[PDB]
Symmetry: C2
Subunit: 219 residues, 2 copies
């Protein structure tokens, strides 16, 4: 079984958490795109969706699903999204797809965070297999890079990339993250950092993993 | 004298901190505008400036001063900026002029934060005379508004304002800030908040107050 098949398995299993006639919180990225197709498969069952990227929005509308603005809801029952790494404590590293800012915002509206992932995303130590994405105000790029290096990392600017919010992304190499909640908060106080890729203060509530033996739910 | 004359006195006094052949960090707002005019006065003594707003940038260029990008420097000797409130510990509330995000970015670059105010800006309790400005990603406006109400404030969207960074502002009324350091950190952890107007983790180093009796320096 290949990686795409596993993503499809997790996405299909996520449908079990979708409540009739309600608005679904949707993330961004390749695994979520599998979820957007799955959603189109049961669309009349839902009221619509709130999505974490303009790409996800366009795809959802292409499926005939109405897209609502986050500002139109006081909360969401669930938020379904993938991750670049996820540890046994359900803490994640996100941002490979450069949508981490709106992903953190939509996740904050949802009661239940359902992370859908292929088996390869499960790691014991966050940051060991994937560089930490950090979204940065453009004029703050150099000084945030200096802070990240002082913290022990090797920041690298993602060439030519701009987020839906108009910011740049610095990916931090050589930065194993032994204490995720602590680093998340610390980076949150750095001027110029819009969002950092550690989702630890509010991690996943449910983890759906696509494996060769089928989707496995950790709830 | 009125506040405009007190602002000019403080701005004139800030000049003594400007040294030759150096890039000056400059803020934004009515008091800084008096400082920019003062800077023009010694134009040729300085190398240039890094500014906290497009408006400050424009005024500086009109004074014949070269404007540099923050990314062009690794450090600034001083940063001159005003404030809406400042307490005896030199902690400030800023953002009346909607430039708080970039102001916090440039201030982080400077060795010495020089706050120039008229005497009406001195208060014993932050939030007692001025609603707290909070810059928010537009799609997160409603949810951040609900969080601010939960912390006990009365948030009000600043109608029609869009910051240099493309964001909106929520001004929090009836919100006395009894522990600025704690509150600044708490707000920095809210998804959707770009910057909050409490400058307490990094307050002013020098305070120059314009008074009917002349500018008074609190070094």
């Amino acid at each position: 079984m290949n990686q795409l098949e596993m993503k499809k398995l997790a996405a299909q299993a996520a449908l079990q958490y979708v409540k009739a006639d309600r608005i679904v919180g949707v993330g961004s990225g390749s695994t979520v795109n599998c979820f957007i197709e799955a959603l189109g498969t049961i669309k009349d069952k839902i009221q619509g969706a709130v999505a974490a990227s303009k790409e996800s929005e366009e795809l959802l509308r292409k499926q005939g699903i109405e897209v609502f603005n986050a500002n139109d809801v006081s909360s969401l029952d669930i938020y379904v999204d993938g991750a670049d790494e996820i540890n046994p404590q359900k803490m994640m590293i996100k941002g490979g797809g450069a949508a981490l800012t709106r992903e953190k915002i939509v996740a904050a509206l949802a009661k239940k965070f359902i992370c859908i992932v292929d088996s390869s995303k499960q790691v014991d130590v966050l940051g060991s297999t994937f560089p930490l994405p950090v979204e940065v105000i453009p004029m703050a790029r150099s000084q945030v890079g200096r802070k990240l290096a002082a913290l022990g990392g090797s920041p690298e600017y993602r060439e030519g990339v701009v987020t839906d919010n108009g910011n740049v992304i610095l990916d931090v190499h050589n930065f194993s993250i032994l204490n995720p909640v602590e680093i998340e908060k610390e980076l949150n106080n750095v001027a110029g950092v819009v969002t950092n890729g550690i989702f630890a203060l509010r991690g996943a509530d449910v983890v759906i993993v696509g494996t060769p033996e089928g989707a496995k739910v950790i709830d």
